[model samples]
Target chain A: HMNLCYIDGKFLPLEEAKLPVTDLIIQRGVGVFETISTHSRRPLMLTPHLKRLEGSATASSIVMPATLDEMARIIREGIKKMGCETMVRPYITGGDSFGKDHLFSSSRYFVIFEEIRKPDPILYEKGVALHPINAERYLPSTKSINYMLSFTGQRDSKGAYEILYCPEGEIVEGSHSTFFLIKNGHLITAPTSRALSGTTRQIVLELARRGNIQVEERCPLLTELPEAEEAFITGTVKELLPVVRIGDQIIGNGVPGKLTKHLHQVYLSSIVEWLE
Target chain B: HMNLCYIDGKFLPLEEAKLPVTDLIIQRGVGVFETISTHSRRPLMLTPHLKRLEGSATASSIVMPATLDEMARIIREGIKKMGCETMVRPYITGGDSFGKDHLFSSSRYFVIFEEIRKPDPILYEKGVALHPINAERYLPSTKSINYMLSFTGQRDSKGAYEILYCPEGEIVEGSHSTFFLIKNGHLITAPTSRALSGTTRQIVLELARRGNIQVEERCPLLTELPEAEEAFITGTVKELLPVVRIGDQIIGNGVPGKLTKHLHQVYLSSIVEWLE
Candidate 1:
């Protein structure tokens, strides 16, 4: 177990990191979190993750609990202490207060470290199946802590690995990852307005842009998805996992498409080292 | 100070009752909670609160941390230790687990007692002002820990005592309390489908039925609120707070009307002992 964790301002054993029951994160589920992956003890793409963290905090009307410099110092110290590849997640809560109307008065922030998880190679090669869910999240721009939509979709979809949230006739994104589709050889995904702006998704878009692959950021309607030649999902750990099937429909011959494979390699190659 | 609280089957100092930082309630706001008022240190209307708590849990797809009988015994002990009239709030979180995707498993139940709050007599005598906000909650029937609707409404409403959520011209309910309108002698409120089925709101309806007062449960149109003869709000602690104005429009001569006062007295007189 990667047992080191940071709570409030102190680094402690992971088990000793506890949150107050009164914290709005627990009391109201008003929180924003970001997970960063480490390889060879180097935190990958820390700046963009921190920027998104700021964006999420702003979207949820929560002030960043700590300044950017203060946060970076803590992350550096935590990563140094771990001394191995791990996953670091920082949670900034809406703060704690009494009364039904005054719950968002303060903010509490903390970080947790765990062993890095990578999706199974075979699963990625064969592509994972996504079941469509007729649901939408309350806050899609910020990665808020409400997972009711994703949880229900996962539980209801038997034999499916993940859920594609499609409210009405338009598909938004996955429960935990960002969804993408290839329509007429153009890369397309739901806009950030309707789905969480995942860090990996941003990087994928950038990679596609660098390679001059046409990319569109708009909601992909379910009726239009059948014509999509390829589909995949992206996240911190998912790293371009293929979506071979959505519902009973097979996507792109039920296998990882050539473009998805190329983009996955490009995304991995772009992962840079975090300076000490 | 009232200091004792129940946490994970153990009665401890209120300060010691903390949740795991990684708990889904804090991580994602995925949990259920209920507030119970105590009279002479005895929890009032615990069964209804518990049933609502169960409803919230069921809506969130979380198993009850303990059976109703088990919870009653715990509440009995906690209230006994409290030994003073206060607000008792029990929270059931989706529990702590070690994965990013599989966040829901197990359950944690705890209770905290706080000083009870009541509206000022003068405020109720003159009737308080409410402001209408065009917003809606994701899951209103279940008392889930999502308060963004109420928080934003209160901030935007220019210091109104409560928010009247009028989405698309229909008045649903307040952010924290349920809204009621007395229009031409009919006691009217939005249907439970769009707003929370508040315990006090149900009691008020029952009281109206027993008294032979005309009552209707349907969406009150925003256009019709100005014509309402009287207005009030209901909740576990709110009891019956009079709403005099909603954005410059005086409701029933800008005073707490005769029927509202009667129902307030009736609601208070009905408060009784909690049997274990």
Candidate 2:
């Protein structure tokens, strides 16, 4: 059984957490979500995550149940109780659907904190595999939980970390992470309009900018994958893991490249350590 | 406070109907829903509704827990017990989220029967208003329950029945209904690929064909609205409703057109009377 999760304000067992069947989330899959991690018990980049969640709520027309500060405090309380490395998933929906009332003023915010795993050293060393699957997501930038395509795409994943989404022959991003390709010492990724503007991806972009590596924000076509020197996926969970293979295509001698290794180490070292 | 609802196989009160928080519907808003109307005491166009529901489920990759016949029978049983007019909402979801066990083999179906109100006679008689909002829906043909844009667009609806979706100068469908405009003798509606292929819209097109009304299955541009001799919207609850105004521009001298009235009368008459 999983640990206690937060709903509204109560910290109850995750298995027992129940939402009324009438939420728009259940009825329409209409909401936004963010999964956050803690560094040494300190919630990492929480303000930005909350801002993204709020932006998502606004984008989906959700009247947030609590202010950002209040939500942050609730998450902090949950984190304090957990006493371990935690992955926090906070979501907001338009609110509960009360039959004929139809006016869902009780817009809800849900928080669930669980013990999370660190990325495997092997994945960082040997890198992971991805297959190009042609499918597009709805509202790809909002981080909504509409992952049916992602779920189905994983059917052919073959134990790969995530599926490479190449909708209409253009490489967008991974199912749960941002896709990046290194060519001629420049980092390339699809524009945020085309894919999710992920936090780790942003961090990696910042690292590249600081490291003086040229970055290109453009749609990386799958046809152009052969010319890619290296590739990787970035997410809150994925951090900066390398991608060695795209089906039969090997990415630059099938080994993690110099820049990917440097960025991964830099990203890890940049994690804000907690004094408490 | 409503009638009993169905979840899995249980027929329980609405308040007791709760989906576990882990369900994809709650976590990701990832499912399809159909709201059906019962004629007198008989379910109207149930076969087609179920077919659309099944198509939606398939499009969203939801495996049905019960066959169409079985689900229909279950609904019939509930309706028989209710003995009143109802608006039935039957939905199927990818099912319970198994944490990391992500294979959602436990697909689930939900049914809720609510005593529904008939549309105000004045709405059909005097006709309603619509405002063109520049927004587009994802998976327009799937009839999924993502209504955020429509819900928000209602702020300017001013008692309008639906929002006329105008995406990049071409008028799509309504938020919850289908758009139709008559020019000369031809009935025009956006293609299903660009808008929802509403059941009633299909019926209307059929009616037009039978009534010697030429049908055009193409997108209606904003420039074409001025040339429209008649304009109306169609949906499950809307039946056939004339649109008198679009963003303050009166549609054809601001009265229900002859064809619209004929189609509405024909549509209502077409409803199969029940012996039950």
Clashing pairs in 2: A29-B29
lDDT per residue (tens digit) for residues A1-276 in model 1: 666668866898887788877677776667888888876677777887888888877766676778877777788788888877778888888776533444354788898887777888898879999889877776577777677666645555775888888889788998888999998878888887788878788778888889999988888888886788999999876778999999888886888999999998877776663323
TM values, all candidates? 0.92, 0.89
Instruction: In model 1, state the lDDT of residue A169.
Output: 71
Clashing pairs in 1: A29-B29, A95-A106, A145-B28
lDDT for each residue of candidate 2 in B1-276, tens digit (9 for 90 to 100): 258688867888766788777667766666778878787778877888899998887676567778999879878887877788877888787666623544555777889887777779888788888888877876676766655566656655666656788888788888778898888968889998898778788788877877888888988888877788888889876788899888867888799999889888988887673112
Question: Tens digits of per-residue lDDT for model 1 on B1-276?
Answer: 556668866887776678876567776677788988776677777898899999888777787868988877887877777676677778888777523444355878888777777777788788888888766776688887776555645545767888888888788898778999999888989988898888888888888987799988888887886688899998876779998898778887888999999998887777662322
DockQ score of the complex predicted as candidate 1: 0.50
For candidate 2, lDDT tens digit of each residue in A104-135?
A: 45787788788977778888889988878877
DockQ of 2: 0.42
TM-score, candidate 2, is 0.89
Error of 1 at A258 (Å): 1.9
